[PDB]
Nucleic acid binder design. Structure first.
Ligand SMILES: [Cl-]
Ligand SMILES: [Cl-]
Ligand SMILES: [Cl-]
Ligand SMILES: [Cl-]
Ligand SMILES: [Cl-]
Ligand SMILES: [K+]
Ligand SMILES: [Mg+2]
Ligand SMILES: [Mg+2]
Ligand SMILES: [Mg+2]
Ligand SMILES: [Mg+2]
Ligand SMILES: [Mg+2]
Ligand SMILES: [Mg+2]
Ligand SMILES: [Mg+2]
Ligand SMILES: [Mg+2]
Ligand SMILES: [Mg+2]
Ligand SMILES: [Mg+2]
Ligand SMILES: [Mg+2]
Ligand SMILES: [Mg+2]
Ligand SMILES: [Mg+2]
Ligand SMILES: [Mg+2]
Ligand SMILES: [Mg+2]
Ligand code: NA
Ligand code: NA
Ligand code: NA
Ligand code: NA
Ligand code: NA
Ligand code: NA
Ligand code: NA
Ligand code: NA
Ligand code: NA
Ligand code: NA
Ligand code: NA
Ligand code: NA
Ligand code: NA
Ligand code: NA
Ligand code: NA
Ligand code: NA
Ligand code: NA
Lengths: 165, 95, 55, 174
RNA sequence: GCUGGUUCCAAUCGAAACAUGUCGAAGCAUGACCUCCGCCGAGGUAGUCUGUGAGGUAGAGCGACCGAUUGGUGUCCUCCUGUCAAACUCCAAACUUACAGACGCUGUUUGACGCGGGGAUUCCGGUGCGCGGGGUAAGCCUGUGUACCAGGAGGGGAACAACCCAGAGAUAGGUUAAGGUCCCCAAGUGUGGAUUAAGUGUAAUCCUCUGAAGGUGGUCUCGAGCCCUAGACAGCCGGGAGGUGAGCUUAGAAGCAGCUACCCUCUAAGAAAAGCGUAACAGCUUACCGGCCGAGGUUUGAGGCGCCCAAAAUGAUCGGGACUCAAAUCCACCACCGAGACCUGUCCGUACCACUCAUACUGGUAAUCGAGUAGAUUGGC
RNA sequence: UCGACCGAGUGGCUUGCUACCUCGAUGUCGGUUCCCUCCAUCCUGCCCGUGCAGAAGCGGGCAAGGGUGAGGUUGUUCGCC
């Protein structure tokens, strides 16, 4: 468990090219598509997204903890077969290095992992739900934003007028 | 640079747009210039011969004479006068 | 004397409009109370605050 | 804002500086009411609480002053009264008034008496296992009542098992 | 080729801490760059504009290549759906750059641009800002463009190489700059508003001034929806009835173990019961209705300032005192103080001009002359 | 009461990194003796919760006034007993 303080900034050039980079660890992200995959997003009255408020790198282990803790809540509330879908839109393309094992001699790091670069204002997660379940997705997102670096905004992108009043 | 050859860092400047690829039209290869004429130096990626050192792409020189079919063009590199041997295919008349 | 001032200032999403009353003894001074007040209460520059009508 | 409190019948209210005094057949209560830019005055038969300030902190104190004065009206006429009941399981608890303090002997078998000193003009009257605590000032009476209950507090043992103590039973209204 | 030292005054110019080679990296040579001398004789180009050219970084995009990278279907199968690139590009700046013209500035007695020759010094650099590459990071390593320190005074900044003003002959009178105007301390306890109660704060930049994720009916301001004098919201009082203890299950399942149903009357209203509660009934509430009262209520979006989160070693701090409708913060505004800057009198040096054998005198010009380590040049004690 | 994953921090006691200070020298480790301090508190005081009957505990809050000792192995610090 290396701290994200090491990896969270965009200070480095984009390092994505697998033709030049070997030994890249697999992603810990289980699924990018959750709930009912056979159903269209547009079948739902309500669309809610988690928006990242600062440009950052979110590493794959953090994406998974975040996704997990959100989807686990939906499953616990709406039920395993519950009617909704959640998308994790970002993929961890940026490869991460650590200079481990000499000091600063030949310091270029070995490959330790992956992160997703997210610009401020982007949708990280988008969930589609029925009006009755909307407070359950808000709650899932609250748990999710606690597991990633940046402060987040929770936004209802469709059917807000239907919500509460 | 990791190497000092003349083609170092020439990837862009020596490459055609894919539409301009293929044998270039002969009209500009046979163009005739007079002593005193200002010409622009730009290598044509599709024409292998009569070239000059890629560092001089973009120079505008003055035609001072011919050597065989090639032209002798006078430029100033930094503060230094040089004479470039180049064919019409890589030359365009200024204005 | 009570003057009512209406206008708008930049916001998240669309621009936001207000209506505000002040005790100033003039139509000019009433305008500059709104400028002064919103400068304080909203941390807003005077150029950002756009005033349409004073009544 | 401004609020007006009609003084009730057979009650007098005097205001000297930040102090207000209320006199009735049951007694007299004086109170300091002091908060920035709140004026408390007696005008004729009506007590007036007012301020040029409308902010939440000001309204809070205004509402508080109102209830303080009304409580004083109630205390000098009708009076204030708290009911209390002594309970014990094993050791009989002796609860008496000695001078200006109420004294509790044999609490949980303790050799040492527990004491609390009565606030102000408050009266403590014991009849068997019942007590009544009364007076004109709700502050003094309420506290005297509370002190009696607090005096039987036990930190070190399970309270669900050890319940002995004097407890407030009836609490005043209006 | 390493450390130390190398003794009088003044005037002009004024660096390099980089490139190539080197048993070379604590050195040297050759270039770059500084300076002096002779020659040449009319152009030159540190700025901008325009024209004729060069370019593939930022951004963007990828059914435009390429390689990464989602899911769902229709029989490996031409739609839909989710993402990317320093070593990808169907696109594509700002910008940098070759040449020419124009304006500007400069040069033709101060000879520019250039040519030839003499003399060096220098090849440990550093910092800020912008762009970077490496690194968890560094008062870190290594580039790049630029300005500064080095070699740069004076005025601010508590102190303080490179942050702000500012480039400076002597002397003198003014007026400003940065930054300040409650006292220490020159100038305001200035004006019109508003916020903050935390001494928050009184801290531009920074190794240096911390404070984060996450919280906040602390408080101020600006919206949107719904309800309300046909009486809302809250509280208090009263009423929450009958079929009926619904059916099934069960020994009994009585609103409330469980399955299913969830009808019907009397009504102003009251569930085949929303939650406690019982072994099961009691019993307490909620829904729902009426009364008392009387004026706003309620949901939700955004913003400002503060609060929590917040633990270190000799004596606590914003430089200090201390400050709370400020001496804090934000929006404006008014008058001041305050440099060697700028203006101005006189003088000095230097360059140049006129006169001359000679600035030896005399007169004139400098907005476009006056800081300087190493070093080059020259008058003098 | 224990508490994973992931996320945000504080300290400057370890270790590593850097090469800014000193090579015309700032005397080493461990121990000792003597003084002052910090709090992230082991005991003591006052509290809160408890899977608190009591007793004995466990966990937490405030709190640095005082205390925190003697021995066997090992140069040891540390650590074991
Ligand atoms: Cl060539
Ligand atoms: Cl200068
Ligand atoms: Cl203070
Ligand atoms: Cl002399
Ligand atoms: Cl010893
Ligand atoms: K040393
Ligand atoms: Mg006990
Ligand atoms: Mg000298
Ligand atoms: Mg001289
Ligand atoms: Mg040389
Ligand atoms: Mg390129
Ligand atoms: Mg890019
Ligand atoms: Mg470039
Ligand atoms: Mg030096
Ligand atoms: Mg003074
Ligand atoms: Mg402070
Ligand atoms: Mg800062
Ligand atoms: Mg000089
Ligand atoms: Mg010593
Ligand atoms: Mg503590
Ligand atoms: Mg002590
Ligand atoms: Na090595
Ligand atoms: Na977060
Ligand atoms: Na071609
Ligand atoms: Na060097
Ligand atoms: Na060398
Ligand atoms: Na050497
Ligand atoms: Na010109
Ligand atoms: Na950029
Ligand atoms: Na300088
Ligand atoms: Na100073
Ligand atoms: Na303070
Ligand atoms: Na010198
Ligand atoms: Na260290
Ligand atoms: Na020394
Ligand atoms: Na020692
Ligand atoms: Na202590
Ligand atoms: Na021992």
């Amino acid at each position: 468990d290396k701290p994200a303080s090491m990896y969270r900034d965009i200070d480095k050039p984009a390092y994505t090219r697998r033709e030049y980079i070997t030994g890249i660890p697999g992603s810990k992200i289980a699924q990018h598509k959750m709930g009912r995959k056979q159903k269209d997003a547009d079948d739902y009255p309500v669309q809610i997204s988690l928006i990242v408020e600062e440009t950052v790198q979110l590493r794959h282990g953090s994406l998974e903890a975040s996704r997990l803790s959100a989807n686990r809540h939906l499953i616990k509330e709406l039920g395993e077969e519950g009617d909704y879908k959640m998308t994790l839109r970002k993929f961890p393309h940026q490869v991460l290095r650590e200079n481990k094992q000499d000091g600063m001699r030949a310091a270029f790091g070995k490959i330790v992992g992956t992160a997703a670069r997210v610009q401020a204002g982007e949708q990280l997660f988008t969930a589609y739900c029925n009006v009755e379940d909307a407070e359950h997705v808000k709650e899932a997102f609250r748990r999710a934003y606690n597991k990633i670096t940046p402060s987040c905004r929770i936004k209802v992108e469709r059917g807000e007028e239907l919500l509460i009043a | 640079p990791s190497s000092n050859g003349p083609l170092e860092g020439t990837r862009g400047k020596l490459k055609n747009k894919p539409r301009d690829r293929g044998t270039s039209p002969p009209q500009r290869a046979v163009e005739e210039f007079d002593d005193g004429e200002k010409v622009h130096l730009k290598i044509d990626p599709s024409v292998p011969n009569g070239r000059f050192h890629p560092r001089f792409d973009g120079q505008t020189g003055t035609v001072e004479g011919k050597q065989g079919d090639a032209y002798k063009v006078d430029i100033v590199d930094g503060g230094k006068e040089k004479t470039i041997i180049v064919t019409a295919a890589h030359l365009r008349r200024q204005e | 004397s009570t003057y009512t001032v209406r206008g708008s200032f930049p916001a998240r999403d669309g621009p936001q409009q207000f209506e505000k009353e002040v005790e100033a003894p003039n139509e000019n001074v009433a305008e500059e109370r709104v400028y002064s007040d919103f400068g304080s209460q909203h941390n807003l520059k005077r150029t950002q605050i756009t005033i349409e009508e004073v009544a | 804002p401004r609020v007006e409190l009609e003084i009730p019948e057979d009650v007098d209210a005097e205001q000297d500086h930040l102090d207000i005094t209320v006199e009735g057949d049951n007694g007299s209560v004086t109170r300091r009411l002091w908060y920035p830019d709140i004026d408390v005055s007696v005008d004729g038969d009506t007590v007036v609480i007012e301020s040029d300030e409308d902010n939440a902190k000001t309204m809070s104190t205004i509402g508080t002053f109102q209830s303080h004065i009304e409580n004083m009206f109630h205390g000098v006429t009708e009076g204030w009264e708290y009911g209390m009941e002594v309970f014990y399981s094993h050791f009989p608890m002796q609860v008496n008034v000695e001078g200006d303090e109420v004294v509790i002997e044999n609490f949980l078998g303790e050799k040492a008496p527990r004491r609390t000193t009565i606030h102000g003009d408050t009266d403590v009257e014991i009849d068997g296992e019942e007590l009544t605590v009364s007076g004109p000032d709700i502050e003094a009476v309420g506290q005297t009542a509370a002190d009696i209950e607090q005096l039987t507090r036990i930190n070190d043992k399970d309270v669900r098992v050890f319940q002995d103590g004097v407890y407030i039973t009836r609490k005043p209204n209006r």
